[PDB]
Design a binder for this molecule. Sequence first.
Ligand SMILES: N[C@@H](CCC(=O)N[C@@H](CS)C(=O)NCC(=O)O)C(=O)O
Ligand SMILES: N[C@@H](CCC(=O)N[C@@H](CS)C(=O)NCC(=O)O)C(=O)O
Lengths: 203, 203
Amino acid sequence: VMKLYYFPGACSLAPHIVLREAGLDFELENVDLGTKKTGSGADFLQVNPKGYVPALQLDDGQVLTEDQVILQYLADLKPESGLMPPSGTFERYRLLEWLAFISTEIHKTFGPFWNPESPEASKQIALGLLSRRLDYVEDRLEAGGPWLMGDRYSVADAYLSTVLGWCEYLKIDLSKWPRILAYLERNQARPAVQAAMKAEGLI
Amino acid sequence: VMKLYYFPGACSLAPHIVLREAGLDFELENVDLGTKKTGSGADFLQVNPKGYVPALQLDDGQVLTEDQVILQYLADLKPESGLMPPSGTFERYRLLEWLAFISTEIHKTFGPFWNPESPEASKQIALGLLSRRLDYVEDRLEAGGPWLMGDRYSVADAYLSTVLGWCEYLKIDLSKWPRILAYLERNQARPAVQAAMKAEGLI
Ligand SMILES: N[C@@H](CCC(=O)N[C@@H](CS)C(=O)NCC(=O)O)C(=O)O
Ligand SMILES: N[C@@H](CCC(=O)N[C@@H](CS)C(=O)NCC(=O)O)C(=O)O
């Protein structure tokens, strides 16, 4: 079957959730981001040269990387499941827009906080940016249905919620954005999110 | 017709190039990233709340944002032009992978260098990362055809080349990566890249 290379709590949790949401079959492979060795003790850089998670391995034995692409690939395995607007629809671009936005403007923003060697100057700048970005998300949430896409829960929601998960832990205060806070609890309350989190040990 | 909001030399140059490559019709709208006012003097934040370029405005009058999504949307207007593997093909995921990778691991990496207020600590870290990333790109170039996708020139190439354009200007030395250097000259020599650059004033 398919193999997901992940690190507990990492952005690889997003596709982990999606696999469950879509009801797909998969094995989890734990990766040590320190020594780029897998649980089995294999060399992870052989799997993903870029040397990060998530990495998805298909039966062809081919490997896919880049969280937001992996999420797309997974959703397309089960269009039946509607985790993504149908092909040819313009709504689909809106979702891609969200996945792109999340990827560059939010995921990457946490860079400094994850670097043992980052100035506080930069961690201060990151927060500032992170804050401007969350203002947008809060506005959009204020304008829209329960999920990023509105009424339809989609892959963007697993990505966005996973990533914002990191705040309580980096002790970043979200009080300022209540809708976002509600949104997060909304995501975490999903039985598939539960299942993945429990499976990853986050509970 | 379609309206592209850009800043000369910015990541908005990528879709600018693509519009020409695909032979699409469009008007350029210059944006002042300082005062978020357009050339016409309109309020750019009305166009893109997130307040960055590129932003693409369709006839529906709808607006699309996120460089790598815009590039996809443009390529799909003219599948005829092959700036992107066909739908349903797995090669297409490879391209998306490249667009994602470029977006997060390369475009965003230049963050510090564009911030009047960034420590040198962070600019040092950025280079380090940027360097690791370029090693990968060089390897892949060493393994592959002339373009990111090999023989097929695609939207990833307009994105990647546009972004690396910034080095000579931020005086970042690419000597270390000759293939990349060749690749850049390869991109810039394309009559459509020329045309966009001239049109943006970069020549
Ligand atoms: N753009 C990549 C970024 C991947 C990424 O930043 N992964 C983190 C986990 S949240 C990681 O494994 N970092 C460890 C490393 O880069 O060595 C993606 O979205 O897949
Ligand atoms: N993730 C966004 C990033 C856009 C971006 O960083 N644009 C830059 C130009 S290279 C910009 O207009 N920055 C000015 C600002 O953010 O105020 C995208 O790819 O479209």
